[PDB]
Amino acid sequence: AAERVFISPAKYVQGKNVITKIANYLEGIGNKTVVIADEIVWKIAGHTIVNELKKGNIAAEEVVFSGEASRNEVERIANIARKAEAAIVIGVGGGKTLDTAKAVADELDAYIVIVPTAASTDAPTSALSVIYSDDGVFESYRFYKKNPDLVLVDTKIIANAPPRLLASGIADALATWVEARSVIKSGGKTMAGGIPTIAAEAIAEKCEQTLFKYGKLAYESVKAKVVTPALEAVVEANTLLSGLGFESGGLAAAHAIHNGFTALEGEIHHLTHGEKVAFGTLVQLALEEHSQQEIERYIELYLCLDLPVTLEDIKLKDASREDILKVAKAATAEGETIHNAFNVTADDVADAIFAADQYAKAYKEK
Amino acid sequence: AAERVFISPAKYVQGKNVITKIANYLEGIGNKTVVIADEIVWKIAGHTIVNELKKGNIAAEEVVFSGEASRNEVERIANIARKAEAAIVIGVGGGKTLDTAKAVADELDAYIVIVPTAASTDAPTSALSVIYSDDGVFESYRFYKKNPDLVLVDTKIIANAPPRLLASGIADALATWVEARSVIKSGGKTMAGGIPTIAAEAIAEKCEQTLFKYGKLAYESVKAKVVTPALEAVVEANTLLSGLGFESGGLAAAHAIHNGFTALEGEIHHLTHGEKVAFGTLVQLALEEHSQQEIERYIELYLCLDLPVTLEDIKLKDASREDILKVAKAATAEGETIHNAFNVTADDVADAIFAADQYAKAYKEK
Amino acid sequence: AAERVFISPAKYVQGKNVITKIANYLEGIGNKTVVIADEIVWKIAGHTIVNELKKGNIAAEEVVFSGEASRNEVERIANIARKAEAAIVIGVGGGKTLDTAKAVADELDAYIVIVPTAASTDAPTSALSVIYSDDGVFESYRFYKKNPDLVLVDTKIIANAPPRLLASGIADALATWVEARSVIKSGGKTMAGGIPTIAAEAIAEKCEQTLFKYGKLAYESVKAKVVTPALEAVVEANTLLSGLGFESGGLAAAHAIHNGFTALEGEIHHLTHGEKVAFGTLVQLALEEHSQQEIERYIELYLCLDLPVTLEDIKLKDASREDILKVAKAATAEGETIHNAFNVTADDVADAIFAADQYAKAYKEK
Amino acid sequence: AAERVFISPAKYVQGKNVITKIANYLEGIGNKTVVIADEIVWKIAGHTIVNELKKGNIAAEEVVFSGEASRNEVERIANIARKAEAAIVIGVGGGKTLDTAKAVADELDAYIVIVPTAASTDAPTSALSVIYSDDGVFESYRFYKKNPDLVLVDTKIIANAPPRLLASGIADALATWVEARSVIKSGGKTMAGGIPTIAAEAIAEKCEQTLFKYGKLAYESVKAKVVTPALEAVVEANTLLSGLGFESGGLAAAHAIHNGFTALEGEIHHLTHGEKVAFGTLVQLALEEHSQQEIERYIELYLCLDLPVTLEDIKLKDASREDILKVAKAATAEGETIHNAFNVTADDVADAIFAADQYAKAYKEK
Ligand SMILES: NC(=O)c1ccc[n+]([C@@H]2O[C@H](COP(=O)([O-])OP(=O)(O)OC[C@H]3O[C@@H](n4cnc5c(N)ncnc54)[C@H](O)[C@@H]3O)[C@@H](O)[C@H]2O)c1
Ligand SMILES: NC(=O)c1ccc[n+]([C@@H]2O[C@H](COP(=O)([O-])OP(=O)(O)OC[C@H]3O[C@@H](n4cnc5c(N)ncnc54)[C@H](O)[C@@H]3O)[C@@H](O)[C@H]2O)c1
Ligand SMILES: NC(=O)c1ccc[n+]([C@@H]2O[C@H](COP(=O)([O-])OP(=O)(O)OC[C@H]3O[C@@H](n4cnc5c(N)ncnc54)[C@H](O)[C@@H]3O)[C@@H](O)[C@H]2O)c1
Ligand SMILES: NC(=O)c1ccc[n+]([C@@H]2O[C@H](COP(=O)([O-])OP(=O)(O)OC[C@H]3O[C@@H](n4cnc5c(N)ncnc54)[C@H](O)[C@@H]3O)[C@@H](O)[C@H]2O)c1
Ligand SMILES: [Zn+2]
Ligand SMILES: [Zn+2]
Ligand SMILES: [Zn+2]
Ligand SMILES: [Zn+2]
Ligand SMILES: [Zn+2]
Ligand SMILES: [Zn+2]
Ligand SMILES: [Zn+2]
Ligand SMILES: [Zn+2]
Known part of the structure; x- marks a missing residue:
């Protein structure tokens, strides 16, 4: 095939x-x-x-x-x-x-x-x-x-190194399984050029498991500036597993949303690559069929790591529908990675960005 | 560390x-x-x-x-x-x-x-x-x-290609997890030069899962000379997963036993690399603490694939203790991979070769 | 207390x-x-x-x-x-x-x-x-x-050493948990002088687990006259675990039945201590409330180890009720260990000996 | 072997x-x-x-x-x-x-x-x-x-006797399984002279189970100065199970850290042997690969028993890296027990002491 x-x-x-x-x-x-x-x-x-x-x-x-x-x-x-x-x-x-x-x-x-x-x-x-x-x-x-x-x-x-940079790396790496899984399911292609291998799937899935298991301990390790087995595991997940997993596993909506932010000018661009990807990952989850509990599992971890989960956190507080649509149009441009796993329009994506913000707010109000 | x-x-x-x-x-x-x-x-x-x-x-x-x-x-x-x-x-x-x-x-x-x-x-x-x-x-x-x-x-x-060559490849690949797991547990080194990464562990463990799930279907696919998803999975396991897993995951007793056979001259050398490794894998399992059911899970698969499981099958029927000790001494030479995971003597290994043969015979008599 | x-x-x-x-x-x-x-x-x-x-x-x-x-x-x-x-x-x-x-x-x-x-x-x-x-x-x-x-x-x-002697030792050791568990439940005393400790309970229960997991592999190891991890585990179970477990864990009906056989003269006395205890253990299980599956789990293992499970196997084929009652009276004498866990009469015990023989025969006819 | x-x-x-x-x-x-x-x-x-x-x-x-x-x-x-x-x-x-x-x-x-x-x-x-x-x-x-x-x-x-002395004993006994398990996995030796027996493993593992099940009830029993089944179980765990388990099961990092404290002079030496071992146990867990939940299971119990979990609790509040390195060098001296299960340097251990303190603080802030 x-x-x-x-x-x-x-x-x-x-x-x-x-x-x-x-x-x-x-x-x-x-x-x-x-x-x-x-x-x-x-x-x-x-x-x-x-x-x-x-x-x-x-x-x-x-x-x-x-x-x-x-x-x-x-x-x-x-x-x-x-x-x-x-x-x-x-x-x-x-x-x-x-x-x-x-x-x-x-x-x-x-x-x-x-x-x-x-x-x-x-x-x-x-x-x-x-x-x-x-x-x-x-x-x-x-x-x-x-x-x-x-x-x-x-x-x-x-x-x-600054704890914020480890948290950013964990955010970039948490996108790995969510995006590769969506490409594997849709039969799409990876940046390597073909469909994913079982090797990439194993690597990407282990990436997520590693982060949920050791991510908070690794973050506390960096706060105290010490090297622990938890930090060693998360540095490998953020670098080797996340790296192979995205390149040979596949990109989808999370990174397309991250790219869509370049359609806007503003303070959002002082955020790191990983901080933007954390929000992009929530948007991808809002475009998928997950229960509230599933989505909250990620929101909970992002909050513990001081990562952004709302439009206000990414410096787009009370952004207009028109501004969000610019992001969505850029994220759905021909050639973007979202098409490897979804068949959605810019309007569908703009709705998902507002939905993700609403789901996070609902979680925070608890 | x-x-x-x-x-x-x-x-x-x-x-x-x-x-x-x-x-x-x-x-x-x-x-x-x-x-x-x-x-x-x-x-x-x-x-x-x-x-x-x-x-x-x-x-x-x-x-x-x-x-x-x-x-x-x-x-x-x-x-x-x-x-x-x-x-x-x-x-x-x-x-x-x-x-x-x-x-x-x-x-x-x-x-x-x-x-x-x-x-x-x-x-x-x-x-x-x-x-x-x-x-x-x-x-x-x-x-x-x-x-x-x-x-x-x-x-x-x-x-x-001949079904025997796919079965040989499955045998070589089934050694992957058994050997890498033993190196991961013992803190030993891999051929890559250091301790295994989580990536190699994920790859090696997925290798075994893939083979137990699709190995027989892949073998039947080759018998009929057709390409199926089962064959695609097993060819990746035999090549990419087994390859990364052994090199970056670690070798231990199974391949050391395979090398020990070179101490002998005879018809055993007409067997393939994988056929020899299948027996070597049973020997490693006999050196580990596994229940009878665990060991039989592998014996059952080897038999289905027409792979050797007894000394008679590897052309050493009624071999003498002295001949087996030559294999064991060669397998335990300084520098061999068995030392990465075990602290055993040649005598311990010679006993394990006879034990593996006995366990397989006991299974066959059922 | x-x-x-x-x-x-x-x-x-x-x-x-x-x-x-x-x-x-x-x-x-x-x-x-x-x-x-x-x-x-x-x-x-x-x-x-x-x-x-x-x-x-x-x-x-x-x-x-x-x-x-x-x-x-x-x-x-x-x-x-x-x-x-x-x-x-x-x-x-x-x-x-x-x-x-x-x-x-x-x-x-x-x-x-x-x-x-x-x-x-x-x-x-x-x-x-x-x-x-x-x-x-x-x-x-x-x-x-x-x-x-x-x-x-x-x-x-x-x-x-002769495989029959290892099988006898496994039989003696399989009685350990069955008897100690009955003493722990009844509040009886051990040979050490008091009620069992948690240490003895842990040891006795691990004894049984060890035997079910490695007993057959150990028996095959002895047949081939080699030392394997399975044999090392079973030798410890037969010696240290069974020894501490019975002495500090408690004896009950199985060993009382073994002693009751001395009331008889005959070929039964050429059997080993362990062979007699295997049958005594089935009798104790017949005196307890177990399902058929539970009892068959032990019968199956005894048969695999060539141990006796019927009156015919212990050289009492077609023994008379009167002969069995002599065994039962001896097994229920004042001072015997059966009283540490059961409140039964000689007649109850004679019935249980015939029941055990019947259950084993029913299993064999399958 | x-x-x-x-x-x-x-x-x-x-x-x-x-x-x-x-x-x-x-x-x-x-x-x-x-x-x-x-x-x-x-x-x-x-x-x-x-x-x-x-x-x-x-x-x-x-x-x-x-x-x-x-x-x-x-x-x-x-x-x-x-x-x-x-x-x-x-x-x-x-x-x-x-x-x-x-x-x-x-x-x-x-x-x-x-x-x-x-x-x-x-x-x-x-x-x-x-x-x-x-x-x-x-x-x-x-x-x-x-x-x-x-x-x-x-x-x-x-x-x-003072409740603090029972809590200290529970702390010493909680180290039993953590340390023996690490020795069993690494193939190291015990104080008895060889590798652990299955008996010691059964005893050590039961020690931990007993403490998690009855430890708090035993502590409340002592507060009220009464003898209960919970207290009887924990006194056996603190004495017979912990005693056999450490001596015949193995010591590793927890007790080496306890010994390392002698490199320091100060109020820390008014703490009991068990109080020091509680912290040493957290350090060993920080040197192992455990998830946050696993580590918190122990922290939670120590807190309930009023045992120390931070450097401040062991009278080393804001201790310097240099002071901690003296502890670590002493804990990693030739001949110490940490080498029976780990291959770590003094620097690795000093990092683990700060990590344990950070993990405990993170738990307390909740
Ligand atoms: N080619 C790719 O696959 C790829 C994939 C993901 C992200 N990226 C790119 O990565 C870039 C973002 O990289 P980034 O988030 O690391 O930011 P960055 O490279 O712009 O900045 C990192 C900042 O951290 C500082 N820093 C680095 N190590 C430090 C240390 N030990 N202590 C203190 N400060 C330290 C640097 O001085 C710098 O100011 C983007 O341009 C993005 O496109 C590329
Ligand atoms: N460097 C390594 O990591 C490494 C690892 C494992 C094994 N090995 C080496 O691999 C060698 C064994 O290789 P092998 O088992 O493939 O044997 P091989 O290379 O000696 O022989 C393969 C045989 O199959 C035939 N063949 C190949 N493709 C065929 C096809 N499509 N149809 C029909 N016949 C075909 C070949 O003509 C040949 O006779 C050993 O020398 C061993 O040391 C090397
Ligand atoms: N004191 C106790 O707690 C206690 C507990 C259980 C059983 N027992 C006693 O144990 C006795 C039964 O002991 P047993 O079953 O070992 O029988 P045993 O001592 O009478 O005989 C063992 C037989 O095996 C042979 N033998 C031993 N090692 C051998 C080897 N390596 N190779 C070949 N042959 C070997 C011996 O020569 C002997 O003929 C009884 O008298 C019983 O009362 C005592
Ligand atoms: N040899 C070993 O294996 C081994 C193992 C562990 C600990 N230790 C040693 O144990 C010692 C620490 O022992 P410890 O913690 O019991 O302290 P300890 O012996 O110094 O003091 C116990 C204190 O409690 C008091 N006490 C005892 N029973 C009491 C009661 N019923 N009511 C009131 N007070 C009572 C005593 O008077 C004493 O002041 C150390 O020297 C350590 O090296 C030895
Ligand atoms: Zn990224
Ligand atoms: Zn700005
Ligand atoms: Zn090979
Ligand atoms: Zn030839
Ligand atoms: Zn006995
Ligand atoms: Zn006779
Ligand atoms: Zn202690
Ligand atoms: Zn003082």
Whole structure:
């Protein structure tokens, strides 16, 4: 019938203090690298990484990332890297830094090492970058012929990152099963190119189980800045499971709603990718046939993690029907992922956004 | 504490007649390839593949594989490939052909495409080759810095392969959960280098569930030479799930016993890799604490698939204690995988081999 | 209300080849021992033990046990031991040898080591010996102020002992929960002197679970003369769990029926202690309120282990009501254990013996 | 494979007013004893015991225990006992008195009777004493060739002991299953010398079940100073089950953390052994993979029993990372019990101590 496709980064390594073994993971690969990080991350981990590379006689061009994943920034860094004759690109930071590093590596056909300093999105493992305008407006997607070569996740670094970034990552990862399940049921396609494999289904379903079981303990672990088995499990769920699950499992309405928000200008854009996805996930559940108890199971967890569940929480308090319809039209554009699992109109989606807000308010009033 | 590592082939594609899209999956990669297959496989799929490559203006050096994964054969093919300026290596066939192709690709730093023509072992996705002497005697392992770039699995080709080869593949895949579970419980390491990830555990456990649910239907599908959803599920379990699960999930006693058989000369070596692993799996279960019902659940399935469950079935009828001890000493050598999950002596293992044979005989007498 | 009492041997050690560490377990204790075994056991383990003691500079008076646990034999060995100035008594063999060794140790106030060479009864751990006449007729009980100091159980030796002796031991151990449960429910006393403790209840109940789960696998292990985890579990159940469970958990009708058989002369006395107890256990179940399915669960296991379940199997085929009443009167004598859990007459018990035979016959006819 | 070892006191007797039968339990043993108790316990039970011994014509040297289990105190009492020609040592009181009595009995090779007047720790049944400096600083362990000969537990005396001492005993006993389960799973050793037996596993698991079922009722019973079936069950769990379970079942992280506190000076040392173990148990659970609900099940019970669950409760409010690391380094010293079940570093343990405190705080904020 249809072909099933699964893709994956070549190697994923996760553990406490693994950043100190970076020189060991590159011995056979090369001795000239470029390290990309923003100003904050240079202090948190960038210098530590350079030090470890120096101790291994690996050279490192130090690049200060502008802060936005834009074409101009990519061009700029690639030039610096070409000049430096870098064979390895090391991206260090959050989603925008990592997406930029992948683009730079593609331009150079270099080995790419992805070092997330927060478990805030499932960008790390994927074969795509989300490109923005220099001003921070979404512009396009950049797909690659390969997923990253090495994803190196140090849980000590992540235990010290802001709790809000772990909660955002849990939100992005909770969308995984909800969206992949909808694609599996509808016979739709994934970003990998075919129908999901059983491997992706197993991974996506385990992602949700892991988050419900350990998510709150992991959040408390980060608040106390310590590494625990609960945190190790949730960092893997937020990174490897969520990453494989969305890319090879499928996207549907939750991420389409997240994209629809770009049709609006405003304070909503100060929210993180995960915070927007949390609301988008409730909207997808409102478009599905679930009982009140089922939906409340997710609302309860989002609230415990201080994640947004109402239009007021996402800075659209008392938004107008017309504003919501702009989001819905953008979320239902040709090519969006919602069509992989639903046959709905923009009006159906606008109704579901208001419904989700109403269901959350009803829960809160208890 | 410990680091968890997961590795994987870059892309896995599975479906009916996917062999006819080979030219499409290589467009961006190159136009000069080397195709490796044995005499039988050249007729079954090798010519079809070359034809599709020609239609896409991709050149193909045709190589007839000797039949054994040996150093000499690897050297020979690599020379042919260098001369032909091949940038892509396509291995077509069973485990020995695929393991040889990986070695050839490593020598050339070429893109490697693995096209299994039977779902007989979990060799396809792994970053290692098992090397033998020209005469067919195990010699060593060859590990690589990368898993294969593309694994292309055509279920139409596999539906027409001998039922014995599907049963062998199911046997190799049934060892996956039993061995990975034992490594997860003991805190041991995997071939990927660290402790298992939750991803590998989910994959390995789903592997077993898939086989118990669809294995017999898949076997009947192959007997009738047709492709069904049951066959598609079992081919994925035998290839992608079993492959990731053993490599990134862990090996333990079952495969160590399989290796121990090389200490013996005889007709046992005409059995397939999977047939030997089926018995090795029963031995591992006899070394664990399981009730009779648990063990019989596996014996029952092996019998339905015409797989060996007694010493007589593996051509060691009335073998002596001394012969069995040679197997056990080889299976417990320093460096073997049994030590990742058990603290046993050769004598303990020799007793477990006889116990497994006795348990199977007791089941058969019913 | 009532006091609960638990007693136990000081140390229980079980494992493969532990007999070779005997000198190590006695280093601090003494250097002059007496070793008691019958002619058969001297060849199986007695000489091995003496050799290990010699290598440790521990002297050993070698005694050939007559074969019956009688007062005369005890006197004889004690004299030999006194003369030899033995400070340690080592009993090696089956129940009669061990019961004799305990008596000899009591006479001398010596340290006592119990080394069972078959897991055939729960005599090893208990603070009592069953004394017979020189001719093999029950005579009395001999209780001690202490349980044995060291019980050393070598599973390699037991794996090579006759399968019939393991089946007998499983039969003796299956009586444990059935009898202790009846004492716990009736508020009766145990041989330890008080009401059972929760510890004894936990031990007795786990004894039965262990036997149903691993008993058949252990029996098959012995048939093949190998040590497996199943055998290790059942040897512990037959020795430590059954021993603590009966002594500190309570005896009831099953063992009273076993004792009642001494009222008869005949071929029944060639059966083992465990074989007689298996039938006695069915009689106790026939005196309780169980459904047919419950009773058949035990009958099924006894048959699989080749244990007797009918009057014909215990050599009383077509026994007369008068003969059975002699058994019942003896089983209900003042002081017997049946009174700890039942308020029944000899006639009630004679009816239950015929009922058990009828229930077993009904099962066999299926 | 490995040998399993189980050890136990020779006789355990528990019941209301059993102290009045002490003369009866010693009739065959001797007529000259030494009775050890501190000033408070002499009034609560010491005089009553002497009176009962006098009525039986058994002499009794009265010793007032200093209050600390130190070498000097042991020497002092042993001298007094030698002079008195005492053949029996009777220790009456809490853990320190009992540990001292065992040492004195060892010096004299005397029969030892242990009479706990509170069910506050599982010291009663064990073959070891914890020795301190005269000033109250841990010094070493003193292991014996035998467990105590007689443990006599009067529940009437314990029903009148401070509720805090019963809660402490429940805390010590709740660690039993958590620690033994971790040793059973890891294949580690117990204090008895080998791997756990099934008997110890059954005992340890029943210990936890007993405490969850009857612990609160037993605590309320003591508050009202009455003996109830619930109290009888919990006193057995705190003494016999917890005692056998830890010694023959295994120790792991909970008790290692308890020992680590000796690296600190301060008010924490006024807490009881059980109060410290309660926190140590939460730390072990934080090092394991449990869901939030699982961990909260224990926190809820500790709070009901007024046991400490946070660093503030154990007098380390706002302790520094450096202070906690001293505890962790001491808890992970070579030879500590944590290594029997975990492969962790001091840093991993320091993180787990802060995590446990955070999880408890999160529960309390609800
Ligand atoms: N390609 C993909 O598959 C993909 C998937 C999901 C999300 N994304 C992309 O991810 C981006 C969002 O990424 P994000 O949420 O991580 O935000 P981000 O990358 O913009 O910002 C992360 C912020 O956290 C800070 N930070 C990182 N590590 C820190 C640490 N240890 N301590 C303190 N601060 C730290 C950074 O300095 C930065 O200000 C978007 O552009 C989105 O499109 C991409
Ligand atoms: N590197 C690894 O991880 C790994 C893992 C598992 C097994 N292995 C290796 O796999 C090898 C065993 O491989 P195998 O069991 O597939 O045997 P194989 O490769 O030796 O033989 C397969 C046989 O089946 C035939 N065949 C293949 N496709 C066919 C088709 N469609 N129709 C008819 N015949 C067909 C081939 O001509 C050949 O004779 C061993 O050398 C073992 O070490 C390697
Ligand atoms: N004191 C108690 O609590 C207690 C409890 C239960 C049973 N018992 C007593 O146990 C006795 C029955 O004991 P039993 O059933 O073991 O019989 P047993 O001691 O009379 O005989 C065992 C037989 O097995 C043989 N044997 C032992 N180990 C062997 C080995 N490794 N290989 C081959 N043969 C071996 C011995 O030579 C002997 O002939 C009775 O007298 C009964 O009263 C006592
Ligand atoms: N050897 C072991 O296995 C082992 C195991 C666990 C704990 N321990 C040891 O136990 C000791 C702690 O013992 P503990 O918690 O019982 O404290 P403890 O012995 O120091 O004190 C108990 C306190 O309670 C009082 N007390 C006892 N019975 C009483 C009663 N009926 N009414 C009023 N007060 C009464 C005593 O006078 C004393 O002040 C430690 O030294 C620890 O190392 C030893
Ligand atoms: Zn996302
Ligand atoms: Zn703003
Ligand atoms: Zn295999
Ligand atoms: Zn041959
Ligand atoms: Zn018996
Ligand atoms: Zn006869
Ligand atoms: Zn304790
Ligand atoms: Zn103080």
